[PDB]
Amino acid sequence: AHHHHHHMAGTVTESQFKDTMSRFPQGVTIITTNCNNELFGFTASSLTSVSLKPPLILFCLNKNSFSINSFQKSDKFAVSILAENQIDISKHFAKSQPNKFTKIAYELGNKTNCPLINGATCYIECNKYASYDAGDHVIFIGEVINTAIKNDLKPLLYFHKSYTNLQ
Amino acid sequence: VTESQFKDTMSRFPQGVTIITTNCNNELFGFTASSLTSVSLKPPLILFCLNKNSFSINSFQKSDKFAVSILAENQIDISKHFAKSQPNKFTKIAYELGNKTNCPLINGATCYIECNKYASYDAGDHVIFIGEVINTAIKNDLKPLLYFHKSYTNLQ
Numbered sequence: 001a002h003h004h005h006h007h008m009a010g011t012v013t014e015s016q017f018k019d020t021m022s023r024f025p026q027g028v029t030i031i032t033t034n035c036n037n038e039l040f041g042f043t044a045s046s047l048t049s050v051s052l053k054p055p056l057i058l059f060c061l062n063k064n065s066f067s068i069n070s071f072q073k074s075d076k077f078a079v080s081i082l083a084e085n086q087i088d089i090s091k092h093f094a095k096s097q098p099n100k101f102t103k104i105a106y107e108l109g110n111k112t113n114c115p116l117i118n119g120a121t122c123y124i125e126c127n128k129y130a131s132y133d134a135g136d137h138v139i140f141i142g143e144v145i146n147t148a149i150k151n152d153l154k155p156l157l158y159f160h161k162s163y164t165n166l167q
Numbered sequence: 168v169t170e171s172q173f174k175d176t177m178s179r180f181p182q183g184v185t186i187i188t189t190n191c192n193n194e195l196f197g198f199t200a201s202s203l204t205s206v207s208l209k210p211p212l213i214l215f216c217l218n219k220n221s222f223s224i225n226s227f228q229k230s231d232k233f234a235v236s237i238l239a240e241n242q243i244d245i246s247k248h249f250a251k252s253q254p255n256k257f258t259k260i261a262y263e264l265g266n267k268t269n270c271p272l273i274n275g276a277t278c279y280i281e282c283n284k285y286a287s288y289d290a291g292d293h294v295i296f297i298g299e300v301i302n303t304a305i306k307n308d309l310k311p312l313l314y315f316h317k318s319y320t321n322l323q
């Protein structure tokens with residue numbers, strides 16, 4: 001059967017990890033900031049609600065991303081939850097390149113001045129609340145200071161390493 | 168920001184549904200969680216968040232390991248059960264205690280994950296638990312349970 005034991009090392013490979021975690025479905029967001037009047041953003045599915053009182057959310061960003069320094073230095077960010085018809089937006093922001101916003105329809109949020117992506121199902125503005133190293137990423141926790149639900153369009157899903165939709 | 172605007176807006180982000188468990192001195196604990204996310208590839212880390220007001224919180228704080236079962240679309244009843252606050256949640260549940268952690272993995276789940284606790288952090292009215300993945304298994308090819316707009320639903 002089994003007995004009382006302590007820490008075991010395990011045998012999991014990276015591919016096993018990726019394949020397994022791909023089977024947790026998630027929405028798709030563009031997360032942005034404005035650092036010394038320069039715009040940065042990336043495609044993020046690691047969003048989650050964290051706390052109600054105070055109202056907190058988090059996301060995770062790779063230490064090796066072009067974006068990381070800006071989020072580290074900036075005290076604010078914004079989140080746009082993508083609709084089903086926004087795959088092109090999702091792919092564009094997932095591509096590492098400077099000046100991601102030249103051809104993109106966006107508005108600056110009222111409370112953070114961070115870009116919100118037109119067409120998104122809804123918008124979230126945050127002040128940065130805390131920040132933690134975690135393996136090869138950093139976890140950013142935001143306090144939600146503004147929200148707007150923009151439309152009833154259905155959300156983009158990411159599942160099994162691919163884009164899909166709700167029923 | 169009102170509680171309603173926060174909760175209703177965040178409900179727009181769809182998530183899967185998991186049962187997260189630990190075994191603390193041979194006593195089994197678990198709850199239904201949609202906060203799961205991947206955190207790191209090297210090392211392989213995931214996190215979840217648990218309310219400080221949950222019955223389970225002490226057991227997760229004290230136990231240095233946990234497990235996660237990703238629920239299939241036919242497991243709404245299991246999701247509701249583990250969301251219900253009460254002792255002895257496993258009495259009539261089909262599980263298997265994980266090989267690496269002895270934490271319960273829920274039969275019929277699409278995927279099993281075992282973690283050692285890597286870190287944890289206070290975050291407003293929750294605790295963020297980070298786990299290093301030390302075992303995984305893909306158990307079936309069923310489609311995942313989704314939770315969206317405060318309702319259970321399905322992929323297309």
Ligand SMILES: [Cl-]
Pocket residue numbers: 049050051052
């Ligand atoms: Cl919450």
Ligand SMILES: [Cl-]
Pocket residue numbers: 205206207208
């Ligand atoms: Cl990752």
Ligand SMILES: [Cl-]
Pocket residue numbers: 244245248
């Ligand atoms: Cl049940």
